[PDB]
Subunit: 160 residues, 12 copies
């Protein structure tokens, strides 16, 4: 009665631009995960353990975030690229330095890299929201979670 | 002292239109749940097990979704109708066919029905968001979750 | 030695009548689940919370029951029909009323609907047991569980 | 290489008005949690246990909510004040009465105070959303959750 | 529409003899659980710990069994009596002795008392099954479980 | 250097008075458990479910309590007697009435029986504490736990 | 006082025929377990993973089933023989073929072997039920569980 | 034989002095909880994370403690007052300062406030123990738990 | 750059001799599992329960071991044979005797069968290690676990 | 209004006598833990498994006990010494013998050593209670727990 | 006294070659992780779901493996480099192709890449084992785990 | 039939030197666990909590390690000696100091003592491996785990 008589109903298709916007978020989340693990392993000095542990929590969040974004792309028939070459060639994050780094340095370095990642999400937000508010919801989750990590990490170096 | 002195403070009340819009979402979520179980029981053929299992995950999400929407109606002083006669008389989803269906047919059929359910949510979205953004947030969760199910189901039939 | 030399041994096949008998149970279990959720959402008044919660437990049991019955049908190569139109057209349960209902009314209404569902299982029991005692075992579980729910719900309205 | 150069990328900082708006939400959430426990301990009469238990769920939600808001403030460089004197001096919630209170009275009292808490969040919503949609997402969760609690609690006193 | 009309469909009610038969099972289950704890506390000697632990498992099973039977009585409009005076006055189990008892003695004593409990259930089985096969299903679980306990306990005293 | 050279070091053992006092606690705990289940099964009327559930929680605590006391006796070379005849013959608890009882009646009946049980523990407390403060600690747990149960149950019948 | 005064009460003893009948069930359950693992390890081809996993679930059920039957024999003073030589010499199941087998062949092969195992249980059912209905209940569980496995496995090969 | 024949047996009730003493403990526990969260949110500097985490554990314990004391009051017919105005007006704890505070400062501040809370419990201990040793047991748990928290926190600022 | 330009890279292939060596381990693990269950069911006498339980733990380990070995064979493209006929025809373990066996006898019997199984693993160890050290690692796990079981079981019969 | 204005509020600290008394408990708990493991590893003979398992449970409790006492010392500004040399030099426990020991011997040996440990706690109890009843509470837990362990172990060698 | 008297005892230090060898393993494990996710997101076609899920299990193992290797480097005073640029510049794995790939192609592609990763571990094995057998043990775990993944993935494409 | 004949197949027995080498590892593991707890309780100063927690993880690992070694000795017919006097008299670990120690000092002290424990295992490794590779596998786990702990602890004191 109210039933649609259509045998093939199409779902929501993302524009290629929308897919490209999520791709920008994806590579920065993957890069953040890789840099987070680098910091996690190579951090040394005063309050090593807290930072070591907090960095793993950041990596967990960024990895879950990259899944969320890539899966959202797929749901809307965009196609993600999380390969190493693409991530290195297109990430906006400043390169993480090599070798052992002090806890103080790692705090400042990782805070900057989190903030860079959040900036990318904030930059594409309005364009994403305009096409698909449901995806903007996912972006809000990432912004909230990453900005929480930034606070939890940077607070170590704060002097009051 | 910033304390209010009213003995009676009323809650947010949904308009009849708003109530009607959530009712539209509700009946399609219940119908999708019922069709999902039908497909889950009656699918046979190549890759039976994967689809059988994925369909149960779809049903779980749709059932949780119907609860969310119905409870949201109740919170806003609206009254849901999820009775079988009402669902059958008012759902926009094409009827699920009777008897055993092949994996390939079930994939196509259910994808269309998920697409139809999501279309209803997308159709009422802006009107809901205009009156109550907090409810639109719930709708974003439903859209994201269902379109993910559509991807996980439909990909069986996608060739190269 | 004692091994059967048969390359293709057939399993137990249910008669169509047996399948039809389980189908009667299936539609009443599905209808009970739908009515239970309707009551769960729309119940109001004294002792709201207990009934709200108990009704969800009833729905959980009826949903698990419908899976059990439909899966048993499939195991014996019967084909279930749990679609909304079929449920509405063939259920023996009295229609659940629309709108908010008092806890006292809901208690009486749902007790009657549980008892109707149990009656269907009791009605087909002997015919089912005669063909397949193993399925009668499943029916015993449903009778026991539903009659427990009837007691737990109806006790609210009992005056001694 | 699309890598950014800067070593000190600063995070999103909230305006004083934004921090002030989240502070308003925070004090009302803390007050609600304190009032919720007061009601939880001191409620007596018909259907005591259900209300006793539901009030604990409300408190749990309000406490998680206060953490969410205070932490969001910290993430955005704002400073929460959840101290007893501040909460008492600035909460908009009508004072909860001391001593034992009937279930019927507690239902009415707590519903009013939940509605007051929600009103604060609804009042600041648009200003919060205008500056930071990600924070508005957190507000939506709070509105949804608290309005659910209001329904679950107030339904006890409903007439027909 | 195959919907029934009646608003007050009554449930299956047990005959006085049926309730009496379940009452017989109930008192022997409660007595066994009390005797099981008595043995659990007071057993001493070679292989104490194994018997101590196994007796607790027996008690657990007997207690769950008593709940099952008493609740089944309630479901079928019968009224259990599990009070201490009634249990003592009507149990068919041989009295368990007071004071410390050897493991070997406890094995023999408890095996006899389990067997007595099973005998009661076996004695009422056919009359229960004739009136209500669903209840006989519950009896089968009790027979199976208790006879397993008897084997696990008595095997301690076996010769070759 | 400080090692004792004794081959057999004996444990602290209870005096006959002490053993007798714990036995008094034991029988009232078992009797409360038995009456608790009787009430649990046979309670009917307004707010049935809450009382039904709370009575099971009371029984769980009383059962754990009886184990605690009986095991403490065994630890101190005393012998418990939790057999039905002994419990019925020596309990100080007023007899629980037969048949179905209203929720209001069960509240008053059970509150009285909990209070009787606590009175027994309070009556023996000082004598127990004088001989063995470690056992008095166990009594404090029981008093606290049972008096909480009394509050949670009795509050149903309070009118303010 | 309704207490029995026998110092020795014997348990239910199975006849040799009954013991033999359960032994027939046991050897086919063990053989099915062994063949299930063989198939699980050696299946290759289209939809490998689903079958690999489902076969492990079948093995788990058959192993649990063999335990149930063997323990039931022990409870009734019968003596199981699950040794490899006996299983190989007395199983009624057709031999599982050697080496790697295709998914399609494994589906057909295992379905036949489940069918064979269930046939043994159905063949001995009435004789078992006549002597001991409680054991027949266990058989009903085995029939239901195994025929469910047969459906979940065989449906891979069922076309339209 | 030993059964009391009283229809109404009353529970142990707190004297006004006793109720007053527990109220004193209650407000300091709630105040500690509130200051604990304030410190948790606003702590910054060296070893932020450890302190952030430890303060949450302190708050969890203080919250459980406040429930314990308030529930104990209710059990003994006393009425708690945990409202914000009352806590602020009657707490003995030194006020927690506003704004961000260094880890070193928070360690000293919180240690002092924990000690103040414990002092209150130690001050009321003997009077509580004299009237009701069972409640003194609860006080012992609180003293032990809070003094552990003080050690775990203060140790950060120790120099040896 | 360092990337291999090969479109099809082959994995490690086990020699047929290596596969045959793992096959020897596999049949003895399967035989040990079958004999362990035989002992588990049929053991009687002093300390029945401990042995009954320990034998199940041995069986669990041997079953997990057989999976490990068979899966390792498959990973390296060997093909396991765990069929009943093959196990009986090729196992090196002495046959387990029929009928009920005393705990003392079972201890000695099972210790010998564990030791036989370990001997097979030790016999093939060097040949396995020489081709694939990673598989020798798995053998070390089995040797350690089985030799632990041998100690735990045999200790029952040790006289010092 | 009632707020203390002190900047530094000090915690309760143990006197040298108190610290010394807890140290005495600490070394006997650690020694018991060490002997418990020695017995656990080296026990052989009849009922090996039960004793092996029970000794591990004893060790778990003694280890938790040692943590409790040492942490209590730290909370009260006392310094524990649980080093091997100190434990060996100052423990009151009779030395555990070397080599394999029979189950009968281990039962007697360990019971004696548990009793020695409890004696130490009972000897210091009153002095501890006089200074700090909160710590006496911890001692009550240890006495109760260890005396339970003594009962569970010693009962093996009892003959009645 | 066998105690050493050095105030400083250094740990095992890896040679530069050893560090380099683990670095080779690390970059291929990270690359495999990244390629695994790419395949997981972008696979479409027959048996999509099984591969999608299995690829996630592969990624989990490879991520855990990279952690193990990097942490082992840190333990032995070596410094890992898991940054994207380094992984892309130094991995031996063939590049994963862009865009959607069929199930069959993904099976072949990923199998080759697992084979490549395992080859690196096998290539460095002997050099690692020669310097530090404990690290070789970790390598054995990686080889076993990855070759198992290769089997579970590749078997989809293996025909008869 | 490839079945062996012997009824008494003996297990692998360790040489006196082998048992002696495992005894060396055992005493150093027990000593480390005792020193670890000493440090855990008595550490104070900057980053107390992290070290406090990490030291407990070390103790957990060392205790599991000691069980592993002692049980392996038992499996191979060797007899462990983990008694306090033996540990003190034969441990190679430098004595841990008494009293409170700074975090910086504890980091250096514990790192040295972990390294000493690892050195013992590294010293006996080749002789253990030569006689029994399966035991060397256990040593590898210990080396890996302890060297990880050393890194996690020592990194606190690292400079740049
Ligand atoms: Cl509830
Ligand atoms: Cl799956
Ligand atoms: Cl931490
Ligand atoms: Cl056990
Ligand atoms: Fe994903
Ligand atoms: Fe719901
Ligand atoms: Fe189902
Ligand atoms: Fe928080
Ligand atoms: Fe019950
Ligand atoms: Fe007990
Ligand atoms: Fe079994
Ligand atoms: Fe509470
Ligand atoms: Fe396997
Ligand atoms: Fe500790
Ligand atoms: Fe890691
Ligand atoms: Fe151990
Ligand atoms: Mg599949
Ligand atoms: Mg209620
Ligand atoms: Mg006390
Ligand atoms: Mg720290
Ligand atoms: Mg035993």
């Amino acid at each position: 009665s109210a039933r649609r008589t259509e045998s093939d109903i199409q779902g929501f298709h993302a524009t290629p631009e929308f897919g490209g916007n999520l791709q920008k978020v994806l590579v920065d989340l993957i890069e953040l995960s890789l840099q987070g693990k680098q910091a996690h392993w190579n951090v040394v000095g005063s309050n090593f353990r807290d930072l070591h542990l907090q960095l793993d929590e950041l990596v967990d969040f960024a990895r879950e975030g990259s899944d969320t974004i890539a899966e959202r792309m797929r749901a809307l028939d965009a196609v993600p690229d999380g390969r190493s070459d693409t991530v290195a060639a297109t990430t906006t994050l400043p390169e993480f330095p090599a070798f052992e780094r002090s806890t103080a340095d790692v705090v400042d370095l990782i805070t900057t890299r989190i903030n860079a990642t959040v900036d990318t999400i904030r930059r594409v937000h309005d364009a994403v929201d305009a096409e698909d508010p449901s995806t903007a919801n996912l972006l809000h989750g990432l912004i909230d979670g990453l900005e929480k990590q930034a606070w939890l990490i940077r607070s170590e170096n704060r002097k009051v």
